Amino acid sequence: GKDLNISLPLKTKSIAPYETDVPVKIGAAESLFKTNDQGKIEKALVKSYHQPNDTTLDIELKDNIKFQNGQKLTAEKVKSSLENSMKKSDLVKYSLPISSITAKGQKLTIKTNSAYPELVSELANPFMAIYDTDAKSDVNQTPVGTGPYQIKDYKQSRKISLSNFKDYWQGKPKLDHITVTYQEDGNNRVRNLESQKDDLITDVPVNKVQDIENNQNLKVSKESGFRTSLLMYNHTNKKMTKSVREALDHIIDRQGIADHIYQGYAKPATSPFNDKIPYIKEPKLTKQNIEQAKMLLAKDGYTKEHPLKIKLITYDGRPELSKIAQVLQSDAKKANIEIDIKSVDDIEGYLKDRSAWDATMYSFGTIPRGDTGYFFNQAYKKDGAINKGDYNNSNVDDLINQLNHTVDVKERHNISNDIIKLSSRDVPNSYIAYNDQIVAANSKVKNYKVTPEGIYLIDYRTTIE
């Protein structure tokens, strides 16, 4: 009828909004702020805000908003949501250095101990989406949000069932039901779309785009966006020396990968951040050099007779990652490295054991809200939530800490470029490609989001005709 089936990669365990951006993606939850289609930060649930000094954020909430269970969105509900999310999530906690929150009616006041200009931007983070902390259901299974579709049932790691929330504050949502199912294999997602088992899929493998394009019942949408694929190193393993990271950095053929593996739907990467961001000063592009890799590896004493052995993790959800792993393995052998590839079903869980891997294929949304600070804090500081390999360098830390309280934007740019320059010397990770997000749908599905932040998908205007 007007039911929509969606097939996504990257199965979840908990679907608490502070554990995953999936509730925001599928239309169940909303943050106080959002980014619009051009990537700029906008008030979402907020009616008005002010910053009377650099440690004070005053917010007035819209007055016409309910949770999906009929409860009013008040300042007190927002206070308990943010406080709960900070308590339960390191990601949220390290992005929001809030010292206190007071609330009355629709107004709340958020304080920090020192200036943190990125605070408003991080309140647009989907992990900071607002839910009813007093709801009498398990937030890990059926969180209650303000979004147009309420989560009604969750089969853990498999399927989410959602229903139209008819009192949604922006307008009557246009679908009756949404069913979301997880499928890690990109080729199966496409087969599900072609056979009409699903209506909307993300992370289309680049080698299926033409097949979908030729189908008049289907359509493909692409967006260059801000997602970067990389090779992430485990810095807790002593064999992963700077010589080893540099060697592997030179075994990668970024240009070749962008052309033949991404078939032109990507650009070769240097830093974490897409070079289409105007103020970023990218480091020099590393070009494949097998001899140099062999040389560097000799420094640590590796040879054809006694090669470096590397356990490399990969996963199917981002479909090109394992294709890259395959060519890395093949090329690395020429440089006296024996790579064992292990593909896993739950990448985030697997990487938690730092004794179980030396490097991993990976992908992250490195600049979702227009500022580089989020990435540096979560990926390059010890215990940052996406720092899977525990990279940390006190000199980089110092610049990051200075960035965090820097208000002048031109100065933020300069410090950010200094962090890029200094950290690149360490090769904390090898950034491979800035790669487009590709979404495909039945041609009857209208008004889903494919925008550069790579987070949103469903909103109250998404429909079926």
Ligand X SMILES: N[C@@H](Cc1c[nH]c[nH+]1)C(=O)O
Where does this chain touch ligand X (CB under 6 A) — which range of 48-56, 363-371, 400-408, 457-465? 363-371
Closest CB to ligand X among 61 and 206?
Answer: 206
Strand pairing report for 3-8 and 177-182: parallel
- Quote the DSSP letter at residue 258: I
Q: Which of 205, 268, 319, 365 binds ligand X (CB under 6 A)?
A: 365
d(CA 287, CA 270): 10
Where does this chain touch ligand X (CB under 6 A) — which range of 54-62, 361-369, 395-403, 414-422? 361-369
The DSSP string of 143-187 is ---SSSEEEEEEETTTEEEEEE-TT-TTS--S-SEEEEEE---HH
Residue 10 structure tokens:
């990257």
Give me the least distance between CB of 362 and ligand X, in Å please.
6
Give me the least distance between CB of 179 and ligand X, in Å please.
20
Q: Is 23 helix (H, G, I), strand (E, B) or coil?
A: helix
d(CA 391, CA 19): 22
CA distances from 227 to 375, 431, 438 (A): 12, 11, 12
Where does this chain touch ligand X (CB under 6 A) — which range of 23-31, 69-77, 258-266, 359-367? 359-367
Give me the least distance between CB of 318 and ligand X, in Å please.
5
Binding to ligand X by residue 19, rule CB under 6 A?
no
Binding to ligand X by residue 364, rule CB under 6 A?
yes
Half-sphere exposure at residue 182, Cβ-oriented, CA atoms within 13 angstroms: 20
Subset of residues 381 to 400 that bind ligand X, contact rule: CB under 6 A: 386
Closest CB to ligand X among 173 and 370?
Answer: 370
Closest CB to ligand X among 347 and 457?
Answer: 347
d(CA 248, CA 251): 5
Residue 427, phi-psi category: left (phi > 0), alpha (psi -120 to 50), beta (remainder): left
Binding to ligand X by residue 29, rule CB under 6 A?
no
Give me the least distance between CB of 374 and ligand X, in Å please.
10
Q: Is 341 helix (H, G, I), strand (E, B) or coil?
A: strand
- Using Cβ positions, the residue closest to ligand X within the complex turns out to be 365
Subset of residues 299 to 328 that bind ligand X, contact rule: CB under 6 A: 317-318
Q: Is 316 helix (H, G, I), strand (E, B) or coil?
A: coil
**Would you give the binding string for ligand X spanning residues 335-354, x where CB under 6 A is met?**
------------xx------
Give me the least distance between CB of 317 and ligand X, in Å please.
6
Give me the least distance between CB of 339 and ligand X, in Å please.
20
Contact residues: ligand X, CB under 6 A: 10, 21, 317-318, 347-348, 362-365, 386
